[PDB]
Symmetry: none
Subunit: 93 residues, 3 copies
Amino acid sequence: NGVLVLSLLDKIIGAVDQIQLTQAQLEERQAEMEGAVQSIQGELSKLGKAHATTSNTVSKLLEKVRKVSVNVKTVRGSLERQAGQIKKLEVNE
Amino acid sequence: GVLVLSLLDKIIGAVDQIQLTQAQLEERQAEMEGAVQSIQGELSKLGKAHATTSNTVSKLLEKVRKVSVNVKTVRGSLERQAGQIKKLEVN
Amino acid sequence: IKSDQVNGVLVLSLLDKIIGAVDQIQLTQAQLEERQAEMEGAVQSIQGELSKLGKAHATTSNTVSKLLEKVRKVSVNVKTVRGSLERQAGQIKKLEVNEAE
């Protein structure tokens, strides 16, 4: 039976051997992902500043476009006020 | 003699718990790995999407300027035309 | 190996190293779980921050597609205004040389 005890001992040894190997692999895999995740937060943190900036720009842009359309109306309003003036004079000769 | 076997059983019990715990460790280690790879996916997606939008916005900036300038050349042309007309009004 | 005293020594030293290894594995396994828990919580918060940001960008990309459409509603407006400008210029010069006395 002493043979059965040793027979059972190196089986237990084998198990723990593998469990140690696999758990190494887990420690590694996990370290790796904590790394991935920390990259991602950094980059997500950056893209957020980026967008806030783009956002801020578009608002400027929206205001410039508003100014422009007002000028087109002035210039047009100014324009056929002249057309009226040009009509007045091609009427008197 | 008999003490060694109780030990062995104690150890074996310990070891089997470890084998279950480690298998569920791997399994959600596997899950979060895939969650993380998804997150990199939609992020890097979003990052490109944003570059675009920003390239578009810069192109808009310059379109607006060009227009803005034209509207002013047109205002200035109309100022030259009004001067012209006013002397026609002398006769 | 035939003797008892010696095999006893074998078993003893093996048994003892098995138990040290197992007690380390448990300590490590204790850690692995706590870290896996830390990260489900990080990952979800990341997910939360991220999808929030995509919603942010949608709003913007849409504002831009709007602004893009209003601008060459303004360029249409502008080159009809330029269009009538020299039509006016021609008819003015035609008054100026119609004049030409």
